[PDB]
Design an enzyme around this catalytic site. Structure first.
Site, short mmCIF file in Angstrom:
data_model
loop_
_atom_site.label_atom_id
_atom_site.label_comp_id
_atom_site.label_asym_id
_atom_site.label_seq_id
_atom_site.Cartn_x
_atom_site.Cartn_y
_atom_site.Cartn_z
CG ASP A 230 -2.49 0.67 0.93
OD1 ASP A 230 -2.55 1.78 0.41
OD2 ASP A 230 -3.36 0.05 1.23
CG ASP B 279 -4.37 5.87 0.89
OD1 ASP B 279 -5.32 4.82 1.02
OD2 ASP B 279 -4.10 6.99 1.49
CD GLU C 58 -8.66 4.93 -1.59
OE1 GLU C 58 -7.35 5.29 -1.12
OE2 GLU C 58 -9.47 4.52 -0.76
CG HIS D 242 -8.91 -0.97 4.46
ND1 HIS D 242 -8.75 -1.03 2.88
CD2 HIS D 242 -8.71 0.15 4.88
CE1 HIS D 242 -8.17 0.09 2.70
NE2 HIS D 242 -8.05 0.98 3.37
CG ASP D 243 -11.18 2.44 3.22
OD1 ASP D 243 -10.74 2.41 4.38
OD2 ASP D 243 -10.56 2.88 2.23
O1 LIG Z 1 -5.32 7.51 3.97
C1 LIG Z 1 -6.47 8.14 4.15
C2 LIG Z 1 -7.42 7.27 3.78
O2 LIG Z 1 -7.13 6.85 2.35
C3 LIG Z 1 -7.74 5.60 1.83
O3 LIG Z 1 -9.18 6.15 1.48
C4 LIG Z 1 -7.55 4.47 2.73
O4 LIG Z 1 -8.20 3.29 1.97
C5 LIG Z 1 -8.52 4.83 3.92
O5 LIG Z 1 -8.50 3.60 4.72
C6 LIG Z 1 -7.57 5.98 4.51
O6 LIG Z 1 -8.49 6.46 5.68
#
Ligand SMILES: OC[C@H]1O[C@H](O)[C@H](O)[C@@H](O)[C@@H]1O
Ligand SMILES: [Ca+2]
Length: 586
Positions: A104, A212, A274, A348-349
């Site tokens: 990640d 991320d 993402e 995980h979100d």
């Molecule tokens: O890093 C800030 C955010 O970034 C992304 O959306 C991650 O998947 C999430 O879990 C995190 O809180």
């Protein structure tokens, strides 16, 4: 298939990824936290499921203010998870099982405990001051409190700025208060990011990166106040000025080049961004192979259904068509291009897909979990399965708000309390939403057995870092599901075997067309691969539902489905409750 450049095979296109949340996967030392040796001990399970690759959520040194997404050192494993050598051993073990490994990459922001920020914040004159966004107050309010530089809202609620007493300036943090945004306008900062967060891990053999919030690196100059789009909110979405900003493609091209030039052995590196939200043109600019940016991206439309665009934690009605269209946003844009797509329902979100999109009742949780597996098995793109998804895990029920661990819940709760009151309609709507939507429904420990009280995640005397979902007692656990031939786990094993066996049209299929798009129960479509046609008929309801195969003939053979193989009449044109069928014609 020659007029479809997207059909060119790559390891990462056809790999099924399994996502591990390291805090919650497997504890090997009874401290209540998952760890690397725990993960290592379960790689065989992951391979046996049918995964081709793993993505592990952040395991780097972190205060855990955002459970690993607040990184204090890109080059050191968080000691609770293990040592760097444990990680290298884990990468090697993954590889020796024939699986790929992605890590990640969290470089929009770092922890305020990172040495870069400790230096930056120490004075206004140090060499790293402009590695972050520092701005003076916009004056002071009637109470004497400093006013932030603009009206931007944090992703977790409240203001997107934090005041630093020492230097008398605010710093930007789109996420929690201890996640200061890195300033990508500073070239020295970018180069340092590449060396530490990217180069280090390439040097240690990763096969790629999940990137991320990769769409946030480019801020519009001036950090202007956002328009007031929410009249019942003090703070406003910064999206127009932070999401897919004017330099975002420049930055991703630069990082892509860094990666290409840093790899030492010519291996093929996958990047999945993402990116959250993007027009189809923006998606193409990111994922077209000839752009040399990303391999593929996550787009959130399908996981946003049933939530207000103004606030994730206000629920709104939706119908099946809304979800069909949102899912198709992941992949339709790649048709006849050199782009590539992702397919997923959990991470995980996100809350659990059976609860959101199936029926998590005792009566229907198994069959509807299988229906979701039938759907995903047939869709074009890189498929991701999230820990517990293969078990048919469901949302937890009846948790008081104080039980939730997530900073996203805590910060939003506090912002609502401050703005509207603890006892308000706004709070009531929030509490309603968290029960369906919270990221915490993804984060309860992985359920390995029926053992009390920790379900094989840790020994019975340990206190897990976060509470167990009671569902382990209802047979949602690895040990019980392996032994049950009718389990969701055993079904997912079959679904991955089916997908691989028919990968030309399941993974690489093109010319996707909906059949009866408006139908509130029937999710149906066709795909092509040369002379082959795949036809899906999926009944997202407890009611029996009719369907038609377009250009129906004898050549359409039933190849996969969730009702018992020996009891399905392939010639029937009504689906049983929660029944799904995949037909292929050649
Ligand atoms: O890093 C800030 C955010 O970034 C992304 O959306 C991650 O998947 C999430 O879990 C995190 O809180
Ligand atoms: Ca542990």
């Amino acid at each position: 298939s020659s007029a479809h450049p997207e059909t060119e095979p790559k390891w990462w296109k056809e790999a099924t990824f399994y996502q591990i949340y390291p805090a919650s996967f497997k504890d090997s030392n009874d401290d209540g936290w998952g760890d690397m040796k725990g993960i290592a001990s379960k790689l065989e399970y992951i391979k046996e499921l049918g995964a081709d690759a793993i993505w592990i959520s952040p395991f780097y040194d972190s205060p855990q203010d955002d459970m690993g997404y607040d990184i204090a050192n890109y080059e050191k494993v968080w000691p609770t998870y293990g040592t760097n050598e444990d990680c290298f051993a884990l990468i090697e073990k993954t590889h020796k099982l024939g699986m790929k490994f992605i890590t990640d990459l969290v470089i929009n922001h770092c922890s305020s405990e990172h040495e870069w920020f400790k230096e930056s914040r120490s004075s206004k004159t140090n060499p790293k001051r402009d590695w972050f966004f520092w701005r003076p107050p916009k004056g002071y309010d009637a109470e004497g409190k400093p006013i932030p530089p603009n009206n931007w809202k944090s992703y977790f609620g409240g203001s997107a700025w934090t005041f630093d007493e020492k230097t008398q300036e605010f710093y930007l943090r789109l996420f929690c208060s201890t996640q200061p945004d890195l300033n990508w306008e500073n070239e020295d900062c970018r180069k340092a990011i590449y060396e530490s967060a990217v180069g280090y891990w390439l040097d240690h053999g990763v096969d790629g990166f999940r990137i991320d919030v990769g769409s946030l690196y480019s801020k519009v100059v001036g950090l202007p106040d956002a328009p007031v789009v929410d009249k019942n909110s003090t703070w406003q979405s910064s999206d127009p000025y932070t999401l897919n900003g004017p330099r975002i493609h420049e930055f991703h091209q630069e990082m892509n080049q860094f990666i290409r030039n840093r790899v030492k052995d010519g291996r093929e590196i996958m990047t999945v961004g993402e990116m959250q939200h993007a027009s189809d043109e923006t998606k193409r600019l990111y994922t077209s192979a000839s752009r040399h940016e990303l391999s593929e991206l996550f787009n959130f439309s399908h996981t946003d259904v049933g939530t207000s665009p103004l606030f994730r934690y206000n629920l709104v009605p939706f119908e099946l068509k809304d979800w069909k269209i949102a899912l198709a946003e992941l992949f339709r844009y790649i048709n006849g291009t050199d782009c590539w797509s992702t397919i997923y329902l959990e991470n995980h979100d996100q809350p659990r897909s059976i609860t959101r999109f199936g029926d998590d009742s005792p009566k229907n949780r198994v069959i509807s979990g299988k229906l979701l597996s039938v759907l995903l098995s047939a869709l074009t793109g890189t498929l991701y399965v999230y820990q517990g998804q293969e078990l048919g895990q469901i949302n937890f029920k009846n948790w008081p708000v104080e039980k939730y661990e997530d900073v996203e819940i805590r910060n939003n709760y506090n912002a609502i309390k401050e703005e509207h009151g603890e006892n308000s309609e706004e709070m009531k709507k929030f509490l309603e939403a968290i029960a369906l939507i919270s990221r915490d429904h993804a984060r309860t420990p992985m359920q390995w057995s029926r053992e009390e009280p920790n379900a094989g995640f840790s020994g019975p005397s340990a206190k897990p870092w976060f509470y167990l979902n009671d569902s382990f007692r209802e047979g949602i656990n690895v040990e019980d599901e392996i032994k049950d031939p009718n389990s969701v786990l055993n079904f997912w094993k079959e679904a991955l075997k089916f997908r691989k066996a028919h990968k030309d049209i399941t993974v690489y299929g093109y010319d996707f067309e909906f059949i009866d798009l408006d139908n509130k129960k029937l999710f149906s479509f066709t795909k092509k691969y040369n002379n082959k046609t795949l036809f899906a008929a999926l009944n997202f309801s407890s009611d029996a539902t009719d369907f038609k195969i377009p250009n129906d003939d004898s050549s359409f053979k039933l190849e996969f489905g969730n009702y018992p193989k020996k009891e399905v009449d392939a010639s029937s044109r009504t689906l049983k409750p929660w029944e799904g069928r995949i037909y292929i014609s050649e």
